[PDB]
């Protein structure tokens, strides 16, 4: 089946597309270079992970110097930042004494956590938004079992405390892993909705990782229909906004751990296809995982999600995204695809207009092939993975080659 998408509203990349960042893993010199590369894309939103057991190493004993300096740097570079705090400090963890995962258990008292998020927000008034925990539907962030009621109480205490510091500042709920599914078969969004958590007015967000850009398996590319369903449900619950705070693929060589091996070229291809989908769905903002490759402190797979390598230099995905954003320009308005004949089965098709008024068609199909555009005499085809630019012309319609990877047709 062909999947045509039309976005609900205009997209301004600087407002819409941010990146995750692990700036505290790096020297200031190195993270400022990563920031140079982010600004060269015309982007400014970053999402930073903070781990409570690294910030408060004993009760009321903190390690804030490097975060203090980072916040000043982010403000000086004019980035907009969302910070999330996750994990329990050792003095407050519900972990049993013998657990090797002390910070992966929730706090014994949600108010203690809430006070720390208020202290951070007070200390760092430049931060644009504050996010409460991460992926509480996943065992690795909330042991020993997912607990909707416990997360709801943590989110409520945190939302109250953050709003006391700054009643106007957004409060972002935890990014839910996947589409919020839990091991017990419920979904965290459904369970929190039954608890009335929409009454807190926090931003909703999830991390819809799928093996391929458009779904998990070639015979079931249901990303778009699944995202549409979740997003309509969140809208229907009255959420203020929907973000996706984490999505992406690793270029790692293996061994395979959950994600199939796709390499640097697969990373570039997949990120561009997924971006083309998510920017045409009902998200207010999304954050690619992640700005930089990571060293051996990260898992083998987690080392290679970067736009940038360890030296803060572009990987193929960065160069491809850069070519894509140069073709689109800074702002796209929803539009319709050109009229086609014989578009291949399984194609994806998305139309936009750029700031110069020209049309951009984003399209691909697993089966490749060709498509006829009967009503055009001129258009330019751009392959963002290779940099190839092809002027196409015909007296009676164009023929356009279709690839498994994204291409961009620009036409009047
Ligand atoms: Cl941290
Ligand atoms: Cl896990
Ligand atoms: Cl047309
Ligand atoms: Na297909």
Residue numbers in the entry: 31 to 442
The authors write:
Psl, a polymeric pentasaccharide composed of mannose, rhamnose, and glucose, is produced during the early stages of biofilm formation, serving as a protective barrier against antibiotics and the immune system. The Psl biosynthesis gene cluster, besides encoding various glycosyltransferases, also includes an endoglycosidase, PslG. Here, we show, by activity-based protein profiling, structural studies on enzyme–inhibitor complexes, and defined substrate processing, that PslG is not, as previously suggested, an endo-β-mannosidase but instead a retaining endo-β-glucosidase. PslG was classified as a CAZY glycoside hydrolase (GH) 39 enzyme based on its amino acid sequence (CAZy) and its 3-D structure had been solved. This GH39 family is made up of retaining glycosidases acting on a variety of substrates including β-glucosides, β-galactosides and β-xylosides.
To this end, we obtained X-ray structures of PslG complexed with pentasaccharidic cyclophellitol 20, the most potent inhibitor. We attempted to cocrystallize 20 with PslG and unexpectedly succeeded using batch crystallization. Crystals formed in an Eppendorf tube containing a mixture of 100 μL PslG (10.7 mg/mL in 20 mM MES, pH 6.0, 50 mM NaCl) and 10 μL 20 (20 mM in water) after incubation at room temperature for 1 day, followed by storage at 4 °C (see Supporting Information for experimental details).These crystals yielded a structure at a resolution of 1.55 Å with 20 reacted with Glu276 (the postulated nucleophile) and with Glu165 (the postulated acid–base) positioned nearby. The −1 to −3 subsite sugars are bound in a cavity in the active site, while the −4 and −5 subsite mannose sugars lie at the exterior face of the protein molecule. Atypically, compared to many oligosaccharide binding sites in glycoside hydrolases, there is just a single aromatic stacking interaction with 20 which is between the reacted cyclophellitol and Phe319. The −2 and −4 subsite sugars form single hydrogen bonds to amino acid side chains (Tyr114 and Gln134 respectively), while the other sugar moieties are tethered by several hydrogen bonding interactions: the epoxide-opened cyclophellitol to Arg331, Asp332 and Asn164, mannose (−3) to Asp133, His81 and Gln134, and the α-1,2-linked mannose (−5) to Asp83 and Arg84. As can be seen, trisaccharidic cyclophellitol 18 and tetrasaccharidic cyclophellitol 19 block ABP 4 labeling after 1 h preincubation at 500 μM to 1 mM final concentration, whereas pentasaccharidic cyclophellitol 20 blocks labeling at 8 μM final concentration. Of these, the pentasaccharidic inhibitor proved by far the most potent in a competitive ABPP comparison. This pentasaccharide motif likely resembles the natural substrate recognized by PslG, in the negative subsites.
